[PDB]
């Protein structure tokens, strides 16, 4: 009964109920309680997820302790989270000296010189998107963005990490389109209060992940892995290493992570992105005339051009501001040491709460508004880069961010180029985030999506 | 399913069944099963406790980079054994950084300068000891010596760990001697093949080690450790360091072990010792005469003059050689890791078996006979420290090493000074194992013992 460590450290948080901790509180949610507690509480705080202890901290100073100055002698790990399989050797998954030989292996494949050379292939179905998209616009129905965006993040990631070309949304039959087509918490609450089930679940081969798309996609590598190129991608890139170097399943389990990664994050943000600009037409007017201008009459988009356009990259920002689909940054505390003047035990979870800071008054003005201002190059300065993390910070933060921003960047360069978005009757206004464990509208954007010339 | 690591590593051994491994080979016993693996195998094998993958080895200098070179590094803990509670503190159980802490707060208890200090206070039993054997001399039956020895052994822990005399052979109900009197299979066997288990037990409080017991202890030190000397023992030893330093109930849970460590350790070699000196009279005459010519006249018994006994050593060490009763050594290999040639991968055992190194005809002529000529100084010099491995080696061998030998050896010049010791119709000639995990006589040693005038 690890229930009264907080209490004897002297340390404020909501008081914890027997096995179950503090996990009732996530009835209204992972953000509002953590808004709630910081709110409450103070910089520093501690509840428990079942017997795990956690403790959020919200010093800009010691948030960089954790991230980035100790990382790798403390803070090097994230906590388990279910059955994993052999997808432990997932850089994302991964421990200690395991995870660094990941990390280093697979550092040059996110290259800002290999991100120039899929812009190309990528770009290829930013004209596939548009082209669903006429479709629908000439249609007059509202679009659930979630469905174009996801058909969209799925092109591009089947070719970026496979080289193969399917229109996911026009070949929802392709055996490689279902498969990848496949949070909640009827599996992984138990999973938090009793984590003493995971062992169990491991030796009944049950894995997080399903055997059926698994199977699929580890002898789905097995053939264009040799048998196909026997004779530029994320697959090629990294067995240009193997030839301490990457394994078979190994390289494997990286792709299925790139994909994970990819779908449903590009997606969602995009989708985010768009329910601002339809709810602020004066940000989606001069969005567009900042695309139209860097790129005169429907222009393609390339590398260099994106990097130019500084609005395009405002509105990116401030939509990750508001909606950090990650919620939170955590690491395992390995051993017990001293950060910034306050002792963290071995076994802690030390956990940075992303969306409460985005939106805490301490930094922000007008958290709830959507401001792309506040990232102009006036004010970008001031804001301070352990509040602002939607991508993390330190040698383990996001490795595919610069893939990410580019990739949903050369969307919306193409969807406004051609269209323009407003709300309609079903548009959730104002929108309602989900109250489980997943940073996604509660009911999905529907925008009415009309044609520019 | 681990059970292809060490075919896939090109290591022999015998071939494991599915979930149970190789452990249905354990019917014959921990350490025959070592012995036929190292005739028929060679100097490295594998086998799985389980899915626990164990290699052994028996090369000299491997066991050197295990047991010393790479202990910090690598082979720094052992494997767990089943669910423990608090007793996670004990410095036998510690791991990494933890046990690193306790072993140096714990290192000056067993000084050659302290133990010197406790030889007065466990000189007094060795006369408790002669008194109770009297009494059975002139009964003329037969005696149980673990009986004998296993009391004195609890008097002298008593009085070393916290002070308490008693006569525990004639003090059968002070509450001080039925707790402390209180492995096998029908539990440890399951713990094996379902590992996964022992997160269940732990949140059940189900323990090892029972509760009826630890909970009189760490009480009964609350009253001893402050409300009793609030006005020379292992207690008042540690104390004095706490005044990074231990904690209240880290002190209790590492007196709990030396009790562990200490009483059928002592007592089982004992009992070994004068099994072979009644089967082999000419050396119980041979250090009878030793043990009168450096104590003439049935003196009594110092520190300087125990370690002057030179055949006195020679029958400890050889009986020890005969019986290691740890029979392996055993450390977990923390990292992927090249030893002296070969590959351990993270998670492997690594065993040296010591019973089986203890009677290898490639280091020992004669194994199975009880010859303390070895151990002369002419060819004590012939043995290999890495072969004969009785308290292991490195930096965590036996940390009560030189108390043990003191204790035994002090036992044995009052029982030889006073009588002499002669198989029976009962003395099992020659003598058994035990069948199960446990290094003891399979039937109870008893001789006769006839008193010196
Ligand atoms: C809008 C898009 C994305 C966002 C907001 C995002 C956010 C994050 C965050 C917050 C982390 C944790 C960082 C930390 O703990 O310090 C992370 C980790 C990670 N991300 Fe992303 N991500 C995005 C897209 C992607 C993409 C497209 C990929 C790969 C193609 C990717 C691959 C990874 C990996 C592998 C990790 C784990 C890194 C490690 O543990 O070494 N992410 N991401
Ligand atoms: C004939 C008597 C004894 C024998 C043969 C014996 C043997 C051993 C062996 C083989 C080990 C493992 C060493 C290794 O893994 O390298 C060990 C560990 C240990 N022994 Fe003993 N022992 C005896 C008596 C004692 C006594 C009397 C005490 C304490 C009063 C004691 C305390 C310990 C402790 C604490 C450890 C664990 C050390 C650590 O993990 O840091 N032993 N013993």
């Known amino acids: 009964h690890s229930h009264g460590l907080f ?5 404020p948080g909501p008081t914890p109920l027997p096995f179950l901790g503090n996990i009732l509180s996530y009835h209204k949610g992972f953000c509002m309680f953590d808004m709630e507690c910081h709110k409450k509480y103070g910089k520093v705080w501690g ?64 290259t800002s010189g290999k991100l120039k050379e899929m812009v190309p292939i990528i770009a290829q179905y930013g004209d596939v998107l548009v082209r669903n998209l006429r479709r629908e616009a000439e249609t007059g129905k509202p679009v659930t963005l979630k469905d174009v965006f996801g058909a969209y993040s799925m092109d591009v990631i089947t070719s970026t990490s496979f080289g193969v070309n399917i229109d996911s949304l026009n070949n929802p039959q392709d055996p490689f389109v279902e498969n990848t087509k496949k949070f909640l918490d009827p599996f992984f609450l138990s999973i938090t209060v009793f984590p003493f089930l995971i062992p169990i679940l ?30 530029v991608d994320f697959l090629q890139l990294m067995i240009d290493s193997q030839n301490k170097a990457l394994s078979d399943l190994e390289l494997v389990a990286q792709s299925i992570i790139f994909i994970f990664a990819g779908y449903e994050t590009t997606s969602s943000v995009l989708s985010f992105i768009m329910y601002e ?18 790129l005169p ?19 990116v920002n401030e939509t990750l501001r508001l909606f950090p689909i990650a919620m939170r940054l955590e690491r395992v505390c390995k051993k017990d040491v001293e950060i910034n003047g306050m002792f963290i035990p071995k076994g802690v979870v030390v956990m940075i709460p992303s969306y409460a800071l985005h939106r805490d008054p301490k930094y922000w003005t007008e958290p709830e508004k959507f401001l792309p201002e506040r990232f102009s190059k006036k004010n970008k300065d001031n804001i301070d880069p352990y509040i602002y993390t939607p991508f993390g910070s330190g040698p383990r933060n996001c490795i595919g961010m610069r ?12 969807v406004l180029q051609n269209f323009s978005f407003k709300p309609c009757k079903e548009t959730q206004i104002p929108l309602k985030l989900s109250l489980g464990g997943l940073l996604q509208p509660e009911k999905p954007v529907v925008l009415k999506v009309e044609s520019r010339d």
């Open 47 to 110: 509840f428990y997820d079942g017997q795990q202890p956690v403790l959020a901290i919200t010093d800009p100073d010691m948030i960089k302790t954790v991230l980035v100055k100790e990382c790798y002698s403390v803070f090097t790990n994230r906590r388990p989270f279910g059955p994993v399989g052999f997808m432990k050797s997932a850089i994302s998954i991964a421990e200690d000296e395991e995870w660094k030989r990941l990390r280093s292996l697979l550092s040059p494949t996110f």
């Open 202 to 231: 491991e030796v009944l081969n049950i894995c997080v992940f399903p055997r059926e798309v698994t199977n699929f996609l580890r002898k789905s590598v097995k053939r264009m892995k040799e048998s196909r190129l026997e004779d």
């Open 403 to 414: 893939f990410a921003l580019m990739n949903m960047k050369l969307a919306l360069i193409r």
């Open 7 to 11: 209490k004897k450290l002297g340390i």
């Open 297 to 315: 009459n429907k222009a393609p988009p390339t590398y260099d051009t994106v990097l130019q356009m500084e609005y395009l990259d405002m509105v």
């Open 277 to 294: 600009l339809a709810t602020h037409p004066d940000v989606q007017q001069k969005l567009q005339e900042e695309i139209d201008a860097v």
